[PDB]
Ligand binder design. Sequence first.
Ligand SMILES: CCOC(=O)c1cc(C(C)(C)C)oc1CN
Lengths: 459, 168
Amino acid sequence: EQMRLPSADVYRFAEPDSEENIIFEENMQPKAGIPIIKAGTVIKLIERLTYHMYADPNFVRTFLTTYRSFCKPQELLSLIIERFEIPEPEPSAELKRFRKEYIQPVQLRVLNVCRHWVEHHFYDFERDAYLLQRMEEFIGTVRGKAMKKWVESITKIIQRKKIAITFQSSPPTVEWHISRPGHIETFDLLTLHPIEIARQLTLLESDLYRAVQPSELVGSVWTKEDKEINSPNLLKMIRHTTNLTLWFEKCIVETENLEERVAVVSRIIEILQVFQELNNFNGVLEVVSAMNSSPVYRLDHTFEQIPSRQKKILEEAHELSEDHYKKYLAKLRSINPPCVPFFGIYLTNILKTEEGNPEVLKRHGKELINFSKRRKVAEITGEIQQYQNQPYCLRVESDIKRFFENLNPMGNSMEKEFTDYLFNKSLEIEPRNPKPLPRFPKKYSYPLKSPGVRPSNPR
Amino acid sequence: MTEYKLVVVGACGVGKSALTIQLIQNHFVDEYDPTIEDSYRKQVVIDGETCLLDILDTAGQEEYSAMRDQYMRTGEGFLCVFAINNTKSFEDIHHYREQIKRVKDSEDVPMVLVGNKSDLPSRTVESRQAQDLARSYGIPFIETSAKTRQGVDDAFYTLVREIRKHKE
Ligand SMILES: CCOC(=O)c1cc(C(C)(C)C)oc1CN
């Protein structure tokens, strides 16, 4: 026995499924045994988002993360209210069945959608107070004792949302080299302890990685004209990375004495080694980028004096980027949190996913929303989030932290001006063949020897 | 079998993506998963010589401005791409060419200029203007349409020809 809903003329979600309104991929939702929706009309997507036969957490997350390309927030809310408001078919028995097995489950599922929406995508409501107005009045409308619990829970969440780290066991001892605690004026690449440089950059960069939300990524919004409005945390993260790469380049090419410059490069490689121990891949690549930069890469006299062990360290790290990040990708899949991924790959994959697939598919002349495209985007944003939950077991040092936050190697210069200055500086310190190599005087009045990359004290 | 490492450079909001996606995908599927290896490698026949294109498109990473040298160093040939409806992306080309020349440490790097048409707003860079620029650099100019696949093969194949001429 089937179930007999009302006519589609009075309730749009009663329309039956057909090749013209909903289509599926050939395989089954993993863990769950549910079909994977490929495409559908918004009516059908909403039917299935609140389907009476079973719950679909996967589809709910995916939908709520990606819907805005094809459905405005206000539209979505109107649709779930319409979905909720189920009339009975016209002339007990099937009736009781219809309330218990169609109306009640659907109403619950709508409530579940509201709860997830408000819990995980509250930004829709911060940005549109009228949307929140409508959600509050809808919720206050809702009738049953079956519903009371979910309604109260939604209301509590809304209130929490309107409102404006310490470790598992001991973090390691903070490391100091030449600069002493408090003496922020002495801090520089060679005077801080390389271990601690890498630790404190990793902390900064972890927090930066963790602040980026899917709302800054879905729809490729970081590439559009409103990028500063829509992707502020992503952009701060990238700017920090760029800033550090540039600071490394600068440290290198402004150290004119060959021997001192070798110490500088060697120290950077040591910091890279620690990033690597910490699985800070963003840190790793900010060093690799610097070393591959046109002002640094050409410094053959400097490279020649780098102890071979550290040559090998740098060369291995460069290799992570080769062949479209083949080794980086494998290494990342194989490690466990905490880490700091390199974000660039995600950005390219999201953009290419959105650009390389149609927004709609057509079937028997009917337009269907291409949901599989959105699913792929949500898989990428889901991979980003998996590396965001676990913090590092490292103590912040607030002076070293401030030193790296306020780093500004470019100064008041524009990009072009600055990178030309770096390149010209490179040419000055190691001229092109056949020009002979000049000598330059030492600029550092403290010792150049590294304290190495092993902790100075136990446990 | 010879393999050409191509690199696409250009400003954001230019459809660089589409240019490479349209090369690689089947002439009659609009589908693409950029996560697998076949995403960026295509076997093709050019002037009756079978070869392998490996294409690097870092579209979306434009803000990592300090990684450009690294990405550029990987290429033997370059497509410098602008959008025909964005004058600024056209004016930026000079800078990309200068940077490529510096990265490869060479005055003569295999290179093609590509102007891409997607959808509105309307054209602001006449093809004459781009022909003139391409000519001042001594490189080919190809105009392409994202959506109709017009010019796309021509753009890549021309670059491959430029590499062959350079190597001989
Ligand atoms: C410190 C001087 O930089 C270099 O000379 C250098 C860097 C590299 C990697 C990053 C590609 C491994 O290769 C060289 C050889 N020129």
